[PDB]
Each structure stands twice: as C-alpha cells, then as structure tokens.
Design a protein around this ligand. Structure first.
Ligand code: HEM
Length: 184
C-alpha cells in the first residue's frame, strides 16, 4: 500500500497572506517511494481567497526534459494550513489541455514556514485513497538553504534533511513567467 505518512502536523497559525503569495521553489524533496528516482524540479504559486485555494503548479522531469503544468483548486481547512484540491492540466499559456479527473485529488499540508523557507507535505489520492506522498522544502530563492525551524520540524517526526534529494545541482528548467503571471 502506497500509504501516506502519518504525523503530518499543520503549522499552527500560518500567516495566510504571506504563504499564499508569490512563487515557491522546491529546494529539497523526499518522495516516500524509494524507487521514485527520476530527478525532478518543482515550483508553484498558491493563492487563497474566501477559504478556497487556487494554485498554479509546475513540474519538470530532469530525466526526460519534459515539463508539465497544472492548476489545483480546493477548500482550505479550518486550521488554515491544509487543503485538498482537484487539479486539471494546462499549457504554458494557462489554457486547459486536460480537464480535472474527478477521481483524483491531492492534499497539501504546510508543516512549517519561517523567513523565506517552508516545509510542505503532499498526499496524492485516487477515490479518497492514498496513492503516494512527498515532503518538500520550499524557498523563495532556488539556491537557498532552509531555515533551522524547517530542520526542527523534520526532526520532530524523525526525518533528517540528508535523506532529501537536493535540486540546485540539477539541470532544472523553470517556467517562472507562468507562475509570476498567475491570476494577473
Ligand atoms: C504543492 C506541492 C505539489 C503538488 C500540489 C503536486 C501535484 C502533483 C500532481 C497533481 C501530480 C499528478 C499529475 C498527473 O498525473 O497528471 C503530480 C505528479 C508528480 N509530482 Fe508533484 N506536486 C507537488 C510537489 C512536487 C515536488 C516538490 C516534486 C519533486 C521535486 C514532485 C514530483 C512529482 C512526480 C515525480 C510526479 C509523477 C509525474 C509523472 O507521472 O510523470 N511533486 N504532482
């Protein structure tokens, strides 16, 4: 069973306006499938209004040199640092090229945020059942190292940063304009 991790604790009192703004780059990631060894880069632009999150997602497969673009939309939980979204597929210009498949969703939890850093966890689900999960360290700057608060959050749940894949040395290609222009 590709079971999602337990003990994923949403940050208490996340500053919403701060987190749900601008562009976040993944700097480190830990796919919980040890055989998922394809190198990836990721960036996203999450926005929130009225209790609904609308975000633009960008992945880049370093192995295959193929990128894919998604948008996700879903309700923010009352705790303010977790949301479950449905997603579609779009092209670089924002047009839908594949509609949302109802049977798929994902759940994002913001575990910690400090200064220019954040730590999130994503659980992918098919029909409300776990199909896989990933932790990611985020930063406003592609090359930056995480704040110590991020490490403390990882240690609370027996993870260490060395187990994460480090992005900065890979041949990432980003579409920063797709994200910068999100909702403009
Ligand atoms: C907010 C954070 C993230 C969200 C919401 C997210 C969302 C998604 C979604 C919806 C898919 C499925 C796309 C599809 O099958 O059509 C996907 C696939 C995938 N994502 Fe993420 N992702 C996030 C972060 C990351 C990060 C940080 C990495 C690694 C650096 C990553 C690696 C992957 C991989 C390896 C796949 C499988 C792609 C394939 O089938 O070729 N994701 N992600």
């Amino acid at each position: 069973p590709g079971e999602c991790s337990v003990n994923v604790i949403p940050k208490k009192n996340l500053d919403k306006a701060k987190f749900f703004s601008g562009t976040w780059y993944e700097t480190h990631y830990l796919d919980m499938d040890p055989q998922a060894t394809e190198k990836f880069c990721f960036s996203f632009a999450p926005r929130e209004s009225g209790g609904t999150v609308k975000e633009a997602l960008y992945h880049f497969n370093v192995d295959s040199k193929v990128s894919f673009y998604n948008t996700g939309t879903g309700p923010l939980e009352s705790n303010g640092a977790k949301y479950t979204a449905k997603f579609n597929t779009v092209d670089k210009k924002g047009k839908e090229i594949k509609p949302a498949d109802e049977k798929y969703s994902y759940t994002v939890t913001v575990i910690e945020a400090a200064k220019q850093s954040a730590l999130i966890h994503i659980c992918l689900q098919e029909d409300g059942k776990d199909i896989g999960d990933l932790y990611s360290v985020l930063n406003r700057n592609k090359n930056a190292l995480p704040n110590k608060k991020i490490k403390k959050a990882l240690n609370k749940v027996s993870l260490v940063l060395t187990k994460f894949v480090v992005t900065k040395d890979l041949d990432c290609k980003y579409d920063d304009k797709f994200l910068s222009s999100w909702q403009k």
